[PDB]
Structure 1
Amino acid sequence: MEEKLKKTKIIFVVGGPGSGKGTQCEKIVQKYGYTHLSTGDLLRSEVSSGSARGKKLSEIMEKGQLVPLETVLDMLRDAMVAKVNTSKGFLIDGYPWEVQQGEEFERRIGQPTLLLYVDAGPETMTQRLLKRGETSGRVDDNEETIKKRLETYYKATEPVIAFYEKRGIVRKVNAEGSVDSVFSQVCTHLDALK
């Protein structure tokens, strides 16, 4: 795993819920071929056997809560190996949990190359969460409050992205609009490590 990882580049294609990260994420695989792997589906697909621990994360993933912070990396190291052999690099969508430190992800995988943040929310996620929420009769339908749900999102990820912006490694995409508004950028980050 790692031996290949150290040799391969890691990429994280993700951002804010309702921005449209995933929309481009796979489109990336379509463009360069970065392995599309979410830190969630890793345990979601692992719950089969992993069902031992699956007890909690199984519902969390359904709860929208936080995914295992301990497994995300070991699994992230698990998500790359199966492709590193043929993958120049790989995509990490869904995001692990939280940084605010740095020394953790690379501590398992071994080498972080690029980090993407699909920046939407005040303008977009508010307008997006609706069609996905309201048509379903959800709460995300808070097109008025979504700004604040996104505001509170700042205190969480915002101090992180910027933190990575200091190193100039993270690249926030502008999902503040349509697919192309978010996509012309998703590739900027992908072409930045290239």
Structure 2
Amino acid sequence: SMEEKLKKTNIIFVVGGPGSGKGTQCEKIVQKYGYTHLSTGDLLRSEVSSGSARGKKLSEIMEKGQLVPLETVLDMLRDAMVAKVNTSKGFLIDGYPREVQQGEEFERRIGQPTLLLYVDAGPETMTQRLLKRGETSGRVDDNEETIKKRLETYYKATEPVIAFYEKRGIVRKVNAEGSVDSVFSQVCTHLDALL
């Protein structure tokens, strides 16, 4: 089973706000440590690209800055894991869990996290990076009004996730401000402590 195989492979939740640099940092973790980077947003956007009726409904939700329903995103993530479970040296789950129920369901049905890497940026920094990214086409959810809704959703639903895992004792926090290299230096100090 999935649950059985995953007991021998580390799972790291990587959680931060929109434009926190979480994805950027996950790609550097892959380069250095050779974990599997799975992004729920990337999975959802591929389904938009497919032009399915579901992709249509997903673009509407993402373009409003809201959370896709839990079962839809958890099933896609699960499939992505099954596809790599026999070769993976470890999983970086980027952008899930984004609400407390998402963590509960994942742990009940898939597996338990070793670590939550909290990429902690301020909202002014987040807004700057997303407005900058929005100067090129490709992410229509970088619309300035959608940036605001994404930040609101993050503080309402996603910050409570950090506090939950903090109590459990698995949170390692990095200051997400500064250069990519300076943020990654912190990430490495924490990962090198365990890995």
TM over 0.5: yes
Question: Contact 2:74–2:106 at 8 Å: present in 1 too?
Answer: yes
Partner of 1:179: 180
RMSD: 3.8
Structure 1 pair 132–114 and aligned structure 2 pair: CA distance change class (3 A): same
- Contiguous gaps of at least 5 residues in structure 2: none
| 1:43-80 alpha-carbon deviations (Å, 9 max, x no partner) | 43346779353341143234432123113223222222
Q: 2 CA distance for matches of 1:73 and 1:145?
A: 23
Q: 1 CA distance for matches of 2:97 and 2:11?
A: 13
Q: Secondary structure at the match of 1:100?
A: helix
Tell me the CA shift for residue 37 of structure 1. Answer: 0.9
Q: Percent identity?
A: 98
Question: Contact 1:115–1:171 at 8 Å: present in 2 too?
Answer: yes
Question: Contact 1:15–1:21 at 8 Å: present in 2 too?
Answer: yes
Tell me the CA shift for residue 16 of structure 1. Answer: 1.1
| 1:109-150 alpha-carbon deviations (Å, 9 max, x no partner) | 122222222111245224323323467899999999989985
Aligned length: 194
Tell me the CA shift for residue 162 of structure 1. Answer: 2.0
Q: Secondary structure at the match of 2:67?
A: coil
Q: 1 CA distance for matches of 2:137 and 2:52?
A: 29
With normalisation by structure 1, the TM-score equals 0.77
Q: 2 CA distance for matches of 1:178 and 1:75?
A: 32
Structure 1 pair 21–6 and aligned structure 2 pair: CA distance change class (3 A): same
Counterparts of 1:32-111 in structure 2, within 5 Å, are 32-46=33-47, 51=52, 53-99=54-100, 102-111=103-112
Question: Contact 1:61–1:67 at 8 Å: present in 2 too?
Answer: yes
Q: Secondary structure at the match of 2:38?
A: strand
Structure 1 stretch displaced more, 23-32 or 55-64: 55-64
- Contiguous gaps of at least 5 residues in structure 1: none
Question: Contact 1:21–1:182 at 8 Å: present in 2 too?
Answer: no
Q: 2 CA distance for matches of 1:22 and 1:149?
A: 16
Structure 1 pair 128–53 and aligned structure 2 pair: CA distance change class (3 A): closer
Structure 1 pair 103–59 and aligned structure 2 pair: CA distance change class (3 A): same
Higher helix share: 2
Q: Secondary structure at the match of 1:8?
A: coil
